[PDB]
Amino acid sequence: RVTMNEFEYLKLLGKGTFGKVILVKEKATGRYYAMKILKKEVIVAKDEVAHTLTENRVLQNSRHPFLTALKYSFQTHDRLCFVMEYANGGELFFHLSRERVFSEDRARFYGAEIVSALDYLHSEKNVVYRDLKLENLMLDKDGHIKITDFGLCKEGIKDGATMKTFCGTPEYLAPEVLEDNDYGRAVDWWGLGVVMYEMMCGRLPFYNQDHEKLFELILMEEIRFPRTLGPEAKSLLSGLLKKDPKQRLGGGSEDAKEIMQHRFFAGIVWQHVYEKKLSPPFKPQVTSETDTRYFDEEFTAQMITIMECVDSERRPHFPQFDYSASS
């Protein structure tokens, strides 16, 4: 059985509305993790109960090279804890905020790993991810992609079945999600088009701080590219950012397989992608187990952490928070 006392709390990696992620050491083993700690009372107040449970469920039910692995999830009277593998390289958002643009080769590597994982989710797990963005893409010690945050996932979506929840991130929303008239798994390829456009072009494909103006652009404005972008990347992003999901690269029965076969990925051996046989073009340059240079100072320089059967409305006992991954 796992409690909070089993960990030493080292560095704050990030902080938000619902809680925090702390770099931790498991006392018994000496292993390092990222522990996401959420307040139950804030979860309930903001109606995030069902999404928390989905995060938990998808984490426990997934095993893939480019999906964040969960070691433990447990709970206290007022907290929910997910002990995840520590992705040393931080968010792709961290990197892109600084380098501004990635090379096409580097974006191809990241795109190939994102597709491999979304392919796995759609095909093996009948899951749609729905929140693809730079914040949810992390790099591991070797420079490989880790997708995080599965709370907006949709389970039990086979082939062409549809979803109706209006959700995601405003900047990244697919036109059919904004149309609010049912959507399929191809919303993930829109998201893929957005993040790859950001990597190769240095900006969002559509932006405006006023959401009403933002949503207008995503719905109405044809996709444009910086004129330095090469022809095979222009071809990929145009296909992914087709506003009609039936026209979208990946929008048909073949799904990811359509994207995998596009000329932009021409010499990608998709099995080698799965097997991590492709060498990452950037290896995180950390100097110790606790080096957090790829996390904002705003967090890392701060301070960290601030009844076993209580089941109340403000602090519910959550099911399936008794998890420890089998070896």
């Binding site: 999404h51 959700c167 900047e171 990244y172």
Partner: peptide, 10 residues
Amino acid sequence: GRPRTTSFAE
């Protein structure tokens, strides 16, 4: 660059 974005559901 762009500010951090926030996930939502309604």
